[PDB]
């Protein structure tokens, strides 16, 4: 009934989108590290074969 209560719920929406945005960047960071380590481990091996 009161706009002061709708404003409180409108902040909860923004925080839910920021939670989803952070979850996306954290997932990209984990795959970047996985691929970086997968390249690095093959390069370290190739140096020993060379």
């Amino acid at each position: 009934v009161d706009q002061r209560t709708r404003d409180a719920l409108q902040r909860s929406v923004q925080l839910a989108i920021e939670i989803t945005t952070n979850s996306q960047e954290a997932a990209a960071k984990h795959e970047a590290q996985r691929l970086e380590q997968e390249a690095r481990g093959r390069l370290e091996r190739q140096k020993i074969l060379d």
Binding site: G41, E44, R45, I48, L49
Partner: protein, 50 residues
């Protein structure tokens, strides 16, 4: 790192041969240079005594 150590054992097995050749060649080269000089000086000494 386990894959690097599988490859690194083979590199270390080759370096053990390279190091055996470098050490034996150096030691043999000096000893034979002394043995040649000592033989020349010995055969010469038999004639000088004659």
């Amino acid at each position: 790192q386990s894959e690097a150590e599988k490859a690194r054992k083979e590199l270390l097995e080759l370096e053990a041969l390279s190091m055996a050749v470098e050490s034996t060649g150096t030691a043999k080269a000096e000893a034979e240079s002394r043995a040649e000089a000592a033989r020349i000086e010995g055969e010469g000494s038999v004639l000088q005594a004659k």
